[PDB]
Paper text:
We later discovered that [name] encodes an atypical species‐specific bifunctional dehydrogenase/isomerase enzyme [name], which introduces a cis‐double bond to the saturated acyl substrate of ACP via a backtracking mechanism that expectedly reverses the conventional fatty acid elongation direction. [name] utilizes a [name] (NMO) flavoprotein family conserved flavin mononucleotide (FMN) cofactor and an active residue His182 inside the catalytic tunnel to extract electrons/protons from the acyl substrate for dehydrogenation and cis‐double bond formation, storing the captured electrons in FMN and [4Fe‐4S] cluster cofactors, respectively. Subsequently, [name] transfers the stored electrons back to the oxygen molecule located in the oxyanion hole between FMN and His182, generating superoxide (ROS), which is further excreted by [name] as a major source of peroxide, likely enabling its pathogenic function of gastric mucosa corrosion. Here, it is demonstrated that [name] is essential for [name] growth and gastric colonization by retaining UFA synthesis and producing ROS, respectively, and is a species‐specific anti‐[name] drug target.
Notably, compound 8j (annotated as FBX‐1872, hereinafter) exhibited potent [name] inhibition but only low antibacterial activity with a minimum inhibitory concentration (MIC) value higher than 64 µg mL−1. This could be due to the fact that the carboxyl group of 8j readily deprotonates and acquires negative charge at physiological pH, which reduces its lipophilicity and prevents it from permeating the bacterial cell membrane. Given that FBX‐1991 exhibits moderate solubility, we employed its highly similar analog, compound 8j (FBX‐1872), for further evaluation of binding affinity evaluation against [name]. FBX‐1872 exhibits comparable inhibitory activity against [name] as FBX‐1991 (IC 50: 0.437 ± 0.042 × 10−6 m) and increases the stability of [name] by ≈20.8 °C (ΔTm) at a concentration of 50 × 10−6 m. As expected, FBX‐1872 binds to [name] with a K d value of 0.435 ± 0.046 × 10−6 m. In addition, we also determined the crystal structure of [name] in complex with FBX‐1872 in space group P21 at a resolution of 1.60 Å. The structural comparison suggested that the structures of [name]–FBX‐1991 and [name]–FBX‐1872 complexes are highly similar with an RMSD value of 1.919 and both inhibitors adopt exactly the same conformations inside the catalytic tunnel of [name], indicating similar inhibitory mechanisms of these inhibitors.
Numbering used by the authors: -7 to 177, 195 to 363
The structure:
């Protein structure tokens, strides 16, 4: 008993309009770097009618630095090669060999260096939607002016941030966000109604709930609270089509006690698997830190990486390249609930049937 792409699926979930774009199911696959949500994952998610989201961070690592001009110590040299336009273009092109013209997003952290350049690169590569968190992105329209149809979606954690972003954008660009993703840094079941309420002032911008959403019962709860859709990362992290192939080996064995919150050179906490570089640091076998890729502004070219003990660009790139000893591995809080690695098709069927 296997459901295939030529079979029908009956859903009571309704299509979701984001700006000029429509997705069949009110579900975003959350962007995941480095190299977790590239062409295979994002293309297959979009093929199924959810929003596939390509992570635009660290694209220089794609296919072992296929598209970088300069390499240093096996790393992309500087932001121009770490956020590689040519790699981003090929990732989008390969996604669309799978999903065609179905909508695709690009996720870009606001804290990266060359943020505006990577936003414009994402539009030029074919992104229909830009998603940005890790900051308060008050100038997203500045870099998208040449791409009127690309929808812009900040990630926020409060109704105050919604009101601020809508006012700043409206006053400066005569435009407001096309959607908001709401995530806790405070429980999601109390944040969503507050943000939904605040959006009323600005025209019922769709609100996408994110964080800890696992199954259709969680989706239904979120829609009942006024959310227009959900964003899910960890569930897709555990699919076969994930572009970082180590996770299919790592998640099935992952126990709750091995998930932990850590500091980062970006100045935002991350949730990591207690393995790889995190174990190397505690042994006193930490990899050398010497900023090559210059990934994020808050680090100041290695100042903060040296303080917290690891380089996030180096560690996340090593994981994409298959490095179990020195890679950095992330997970949502529900990562320990992954037992089987299933297909994207199987997952979407589970989340949408009925
Ligand atoms: C492996 C991994 C990589 C991530 N990378 C990004 C990223 O590049 N950009 C971003 O906005 N969020 C990133 N996140 C956060 C997720 O997009 C998402 O907000 C959070 O994990 C979703 O909650 P869930 O995993 O509970 O569904 C990442 C999460 C994981 C697990
Ligand atoms: O909520 C959770 O459980 C959760 C679990 C894991 C990650 C996140 N958020 S995060 O955006 O990924 C993130 C946070 C903190 C520092 N860095 C980050 N990302 C990042 C930075 C630089 C590069 Cl070069 C690449 C990437 Cl991916 C949330
Ligand atoms: S040293 Fe800091 S800015 Fe440089 S690549 Fe590493 S985390 Fe990024």
């Amino acid at each position: 008993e296997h459901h295939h792409h030529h079979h029908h699926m009956v859903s009571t979930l309704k299509p979701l309009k984001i700006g000029k774009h429509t997705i069949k199911f009110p579900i975003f696959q959350g962007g995941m770097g480095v190299g977790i949500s590239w062409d295979e994952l994002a293309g297959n998610v979009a093929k199924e009618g959810a929003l596939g989201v390509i992570s635009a961070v660290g694209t220089g690592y794609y296919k072992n630095m296929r598209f970088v001009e300069r390499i240093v110590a096996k790393k992309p040299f500087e932001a121009l090669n770490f956020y590689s336009k040519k790699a981003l273009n090929e990732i989008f092109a390969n996604a669309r060999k799978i999903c065609g013209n179905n909508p695709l997003g690009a996720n870009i952290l606001y804290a990266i260096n060359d943020y505006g350049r990577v936003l414009r690169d994402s539009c030029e590569a074919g992104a229909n939607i830009i998603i940005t968190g890790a900051g308060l992105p008050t100038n997203m329209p500045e870099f998208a002016k040449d791409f009127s149809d690309v929808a812009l979606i900040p990630i926020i954690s409060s109704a105050k941030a919604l009101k601020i972003l809508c006012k700043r954008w409206s006053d400066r660009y005569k435009r407001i966000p096309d959607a908001f993703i709401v995530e806790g840094p405070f429980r999601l079941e109390n944040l969503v109604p507050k943000v939904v309420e605040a959006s009323k002032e600005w025209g019922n911008i769709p609100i996408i709930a994110a964080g800890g959403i696992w199954d259709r019962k969680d989706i239904d709860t979120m829609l009942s609270l006024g959310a227009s859709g959900v964003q899910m990362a960890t569930r897709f992290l555990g699919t076969k089509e994930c572009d970082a192939k180590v996770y299919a080996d790592l998640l099935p064995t992952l126990k709750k006690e091995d998930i932990l919150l850590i500091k980062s050179p970006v100045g935002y906490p991350a949730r990591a698997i207690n393995t790889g570089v995190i174990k190397r640091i505690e042994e006193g076998n930490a990899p050398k830190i010497a900023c090559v890729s210059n990934c994020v502004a808050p680090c100041n070219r290695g100042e903060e990486a040296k303080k917290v003990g690891y380089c996030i660009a180096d560690g996340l790139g090593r994981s994409y390249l298959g490095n179990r000893e020195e890679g950095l591995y992330f997970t949502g809080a529900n990562g320990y609930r992954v037992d089987k690695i299933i297909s994207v098709h199987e997952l979407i069927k589970e989340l949408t049937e009925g």
